[PDB]
UniProtKB/Swiss-Prot annotation:
Mg(2+) 2 binds at residues 47-48, 99. Belongs to the adenylyl cyclase class-4/guanylyl cyclase family. This is Adenylate cyclase type 10. The lineage of its organism: Eukaryota, Metazoa, Chordata, Craniata, Vertebrata. Changing residue 95 to A: Nearly abolishes bicarbonate-mediated increase of enzyme activity. Abolishes bicarbonate-mediated increase of enzyme activity. It is found in: Cell membrane; Cytoplasm, Cytoskeleton; Cytoplasm, Perinuclear region; Nucleus. Cleavage may occur to generate the active 48 kDa form. Hydrogencarbonate binds at residues 95, 167, 176, 337. Changing residue 176 to A: Reduces bicarbonate-mediated increase of enzyme activity. Abolishes bicarbonate-mediated increase of enzyme activity. Residues 42-179, 293-418 form the Guanylate cyclase domain. It comes from Homo sapiens. The chain holds residues 1 to 468 of 1610 of the full protein. It is linked to Hypercalciuria absorptive 2: A common type of hypercalciuria, a condition characterized by excessive urinary calcium excretion. Absorptive hypercalciuria is due to gastrointestinal hyperabsorption of calcium and is a frequent cause of calcium oxalate nephrolithiasis.
Amino acid sequence: MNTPKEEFQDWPIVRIAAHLPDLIVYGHFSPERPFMDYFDGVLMFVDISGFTAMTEKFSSAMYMDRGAEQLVEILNYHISAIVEKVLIFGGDILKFAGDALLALWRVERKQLKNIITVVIKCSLEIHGLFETQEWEEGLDIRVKIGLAAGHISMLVFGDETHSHFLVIGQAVDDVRLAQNMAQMNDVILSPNCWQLCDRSMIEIESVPDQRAVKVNFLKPPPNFNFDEFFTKCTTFMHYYPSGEHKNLLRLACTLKPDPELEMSLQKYVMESILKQIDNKQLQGYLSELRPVTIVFVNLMFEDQDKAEEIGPAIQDAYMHITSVLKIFQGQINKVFMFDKGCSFLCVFGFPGEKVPDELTHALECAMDIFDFCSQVHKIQTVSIGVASGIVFCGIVGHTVRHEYTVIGQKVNLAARMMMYYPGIVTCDSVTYNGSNLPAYFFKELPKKVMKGVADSGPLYQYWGRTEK
Ligand SMILES: Nc1nc(Cl)cc(-c2nn(C(F)F)cc2Cc2ccccc2OCCN2CCOC[C@H]2CO)n1
C-alpha cells in the first residue's frame, strides 16, 4: 500500500495560534476572569524602533500609493529573522508592538542561571543579523536588547467573547529598566539578571549610576560547547520542537482541530483577522496606511500593589472600556504594562469601523473611560492621550508568529501624552481642530519635551462639557 506524505497542515486553529504565544496556546486555564498564575523565567525585550525614519517616509509620494505594502514587506523581512532566532533558541514571543517585541523563556528556578546564558547568546546573534544592514542607503537598522530574570505573574482578563493577557511583576519591571538604558547594539542585564547569571561566561561593564549591567563579551571556558550546553538546556524546555517535529519553528504548527480549544484561542484575536484566517477576506486587505484616532489609556497603580490587587481592577476597568468602545466603534489593538501602568492602545477608524465624528466620539469615549476608571478600586491615576492621523496597520512578524499591529508617530505621541500629562485626557491639534466642539471644552497646555517625540504641535486638555 502507498504511504503518501501528510499535506501542509493549515487548519484555522493553526492559523489562529500564529497570533498567540505558547503561554496562551498550551496554557489550559480556568474560565474565571481575572485569572492569575505565577512562575519564573527570562525576558528579552528587543527594541525595533530604529525605523521611525521608515514609517513616516513610506507615506511619501515616492512610494506611489504602495507605501503600506512596501513597509509591511521590509519590516517583516527583518522582524522574521529576529523571530526565527528567538524561536530556535527556545523562546516564546509574547507580543509585538510598533517599537518592539517581548520574548519569554519560562523555566524552573534552578535553571534560570543556564537559560540566561542561552538568552545572552541569542541576543548577541540577533545583533549579528544587523551588523552591516540598512533600511535603505545610509539609514541604519540596529536593535537594542534588555534582559531580565526572576518572578513573573501572568494575568488573563476579559469577557465571554474577548480575552487579553499580560505579564507583570519583578522581571517585567526589571526588563523595562534594562531596555530604557539600552543603546544601539547593547545587551543590558537587569540587576536581578546580573545576580542570577553565570558570571564565568560573560564580561560586563557597569552603567554609571545604575545597578544594571552591559554585556561586552560572552567568553565561555576552554571546554565549553554551546550546542551540547543548549541540548542539556532543552531538557527543561517543555515545547521545544523535537524528534519528528525538529524541522518546525513551533510545536503550535502541529495543532489539530479541537473546537473547545479554538473557541478559547479565537477570543484573543480580532474579528477582522479571523475573517482573513477563514479565507473570507483577501490576505492583504489589512495592510494599509489608514487615518485613525488613537486613544491610549493608562491605568496607574501604587508600588504596594501586587498581581492579586491589580487583576480585579484591570478586569473592572476592561469591562467598562469594552462597553464604551463597542458603542463608539473602537478596538483594543494592544494591552501593555510597565512603569506601574496598564495601558490600552485603542483605535477608532481602521477595519470597517470608519464612522464620521470619529473625533468628537473619540474624545467623549475617552472622557467616559476616564470618569469610570477613576472610580475603580485600586486605580490611583487615569491618563488618556488622544491623537489622530495616518498610521500603518498590518500583520507584523513571522509566518509562524505574528500579530496585527498599528505603527506610527500618532501612536507614539498618544503614548507620550498619557505619560507626560498624567491624571487628564489630552488631545493633539488634529483632534482639537477637527472636533465639532467649542473652544471652552478644552484647555491649551504648556509644551513639554517628551522623550522620543519631535514637534508634537499644540496639545490640549479635554476639559469636558462643564467647568464643573
Ligand atoms: N506587561 C506586558 N505583558 C505582555 Cl504579555 C507584553 C508586554 C509588552 N510587549 N511589548 C512589545 F514588545 F510588544 C511591550 C510591552 C510593554 C513593556 C513591558 C516591559 C518593558 C517595556 C514595555 O514596553 C515598552 C514601551 N513601549 C513604548 C510605549 O508604549 C508602550 C510600549 C509598547 O510599544 N507587556
